[PDB]
Design a protein around this ligand. Structure first.
Ligand SMILES: CCCCCCC/C=C\CCCCCC(=O)OC[C@@H](O)CO
Ligand SMILES: CCCCCCCCCCCC[N+](C)(C)[O-]
Ligand SMILES: CCCCCCCCCCCC[N+](C)(C)[O-]
Ligand SMILES: CCCCCCCCCCCC[N+](C)(C)[O-]
Ligand SMILES: CCCCCCCCCCCC[N+](C)(C)[O-]
Ligand SMILES: [Ca+2]
Ligand code: NA
Ligand code: NA
Length: 421
């Protein structure tokens, strides 16, 4: 067994106005290094792992693709795994700050303090667990983000392969927030809570080699349908002197719906192309029909049919399933294990033109009555040597919901050199 290693990364991020030229900041044209040494131990049914992180950048640039000062030191992963409960080789119980992942990247793709149980067999896959955030384990952050404070996650899943390469399964996730929203006229932070309450996500999903870059099948697919219920309290905010002020709350219950469908043509072993459609419900009375995600998602997957993970709702726009409709068109190319290139086009709309949307990457006010968010074109190019050189850039063109006063175009482009030891 290999007890230790080191991962070296050099990232160059160029971000134009993320607020679309409407607020100070939102520009990053800086470089940085990210060093991740790790340790591993194995003694029969028992396992233990650790991963550190040391970052030195010329500005606060993104070096982690997963959901989350210039220099910092942190504890990324620390767990103890037990594999002696059953005779099954793919069954283990993991406890500690670990990486919860799911193939679609839409339910969970993060590093969180959790007690997780995995049961993986030939015809059946089942998982269950609990997760809560108690710290950032970072040197530059002493206080835990109020957003992630007192939010308990209870999740489960069960899948079956009804036909070879064809899977059907159900998922459940409960978020029990026992915290409190800001009182009126308070300084609402950038890391502050948007909601409190009890929420139950119930979903059904069907895939046919949806995230497999090496498939024998001529056509690939994914079909997802999620329902959301429970009691939710949303915090209402106002602008004032560019310092967001809390202006009350809206307490009710939720009855929202989320959908994600897609199809991929495998022309040959190198060339692939496909289409996608996603809908996250919006509006209703007191935001009752407004859909949202668990808050553990990254929205990143191998939906283009390559080894490289691409953002499902744009690298620039970085949308999420909340009052949002999306139309996607893509193309792929891959030379064995030497290269991979992806080209992705997206068109975004609003489900309700009076309500707010789900987005990162963009921090600009939406004008009422206008449904057209905008369009995007993504490019991803990877060269492999352990070591790799990647370019991942997105060019977003704002629509009528942003109106005049906004720049004609917006971009976010990264370069990653990852050499591993
Ligand atoms: C619930 C959170 C617990 C945190 C787990 C801590 C794990 C930290 C480091 C893992 C590496 C352990 C290496 C030391 C060890 O005891 O094994 C001896 C090893 O050298 C022989 O294989
Ligand atoms: C300050 C923390 C640094 C921890 C160092 C991690 C070990 C690096 C080992 C990589 C190079 C040697 N090798 C080839 C034997 O692996
Ligand atoms: C394949 C062509 C990719 C070119 C990269 C995109 C252009 C961004 C230019 C980087 C400098 C950023 N700045 C400061 C001019 O905005
Ligand atoms: C071949 C063009 C690729 C696009 C450039 C990627 C962004 C790198 C910009 C970092 C500039 C660092 N600087 C100026 C702070 O020293
Ligand atoms: C390279 C790994 C070294 C870890 C350095 C991180 C230590 C800072 C985090 C301290 C724990 C957080 N808190 C809030 C509970 O104090
Ligand atoms: Ca700005
Ligand atoms: Na086992
Ligand atoms: Na494929």
């Amino acid at each position: 067994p290999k007890n230790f290693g080191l991962d070296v990364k050099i990232t160059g991020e160029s971000e134009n106005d993320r607020d679309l030229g409407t607020a100070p900041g939102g520009t990053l044209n800086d470089i940085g290094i990210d060093l991740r040494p790790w340790a591993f131990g194995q003694w029969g049914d028992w396992s233990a792992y650790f991963m550190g992180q040391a970052v030195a950048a010329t500005d606060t640039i993104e070096t982690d693709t997963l959901q989350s000062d210039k220099s910092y030191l942190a504890a990324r992963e620390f767990w103890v795994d037990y594999a002696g409960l059953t005779a099954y080789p793919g069954e283990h119980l993991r406890f500690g700050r670990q990486r919860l992942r799911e193939d679609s990247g839409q339910w969970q793709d993060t590093n969180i303090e959790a007690l997780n149980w995995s049961f993986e067999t030939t015809l059946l896959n089942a998982h269950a667990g609990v997760a809560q955030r108690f710290s950032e384990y970072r040197t530059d952050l002493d206080e835990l983000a109020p957003e992630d404070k007192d939010r308990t996650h209870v999740f489960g899943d069960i899948s079956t392969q009804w036909a070879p390469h064809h899977r059907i399964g159900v998922r459940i996730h409960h978020a029990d927030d026992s915290g409190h929203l800001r009182r009126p006229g308070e300084e609402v932070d950038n890391l502050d809570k948007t909601y409190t309450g009890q929420l139950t996500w119930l979903g059904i999903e069907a895939t046919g080699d949806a995230y497999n870059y090496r498939s024998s099948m001529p056509l690939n697919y994914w079909a997802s349908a999620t329902w959301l219920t429970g009691d939710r309290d949303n915090l209402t905010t106002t602008t004032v002197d560019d310092r967001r002020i809390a202006t009350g709350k809206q307490s009710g219950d939720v009855n929202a719906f989320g959908v994600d469908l897609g199809l991929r043509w495998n022309i040959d072993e190198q060339w692939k192309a496909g289409v996608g459609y996603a809908r996250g419900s919006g509006g209703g009375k007191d935001g009752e029909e407004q859909f949202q995600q668990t808050g553990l998602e990254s929205n990143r997957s191998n939906f283009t049919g390559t080894r490289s993970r691409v953002h499902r709702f744009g690298e620039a726009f970085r949308g999420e399933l909340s009052n949002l409709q999306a139309a996607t068109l893509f193309g792929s190319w891959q030379l064995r294990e030497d290269y991979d290139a992806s080209l992705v086009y997206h068109k975004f709309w609003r489900v309700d033109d009076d309500s707010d949307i789900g987005t990162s990457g963009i921090n600009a006010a939406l004008q009422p009555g206008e449904k057209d968010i905008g369009q995007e074109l993504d490019l991803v190019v990877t060269k492999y040597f352990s070591a790799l050189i990647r370019f991942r850039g997105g060019l977003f063109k704002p629509g009528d919901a942003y109106g005049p006063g906004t720049d004609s175009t917006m971009h976010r482009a990264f370069v990653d050199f990852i050499w591993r030891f």
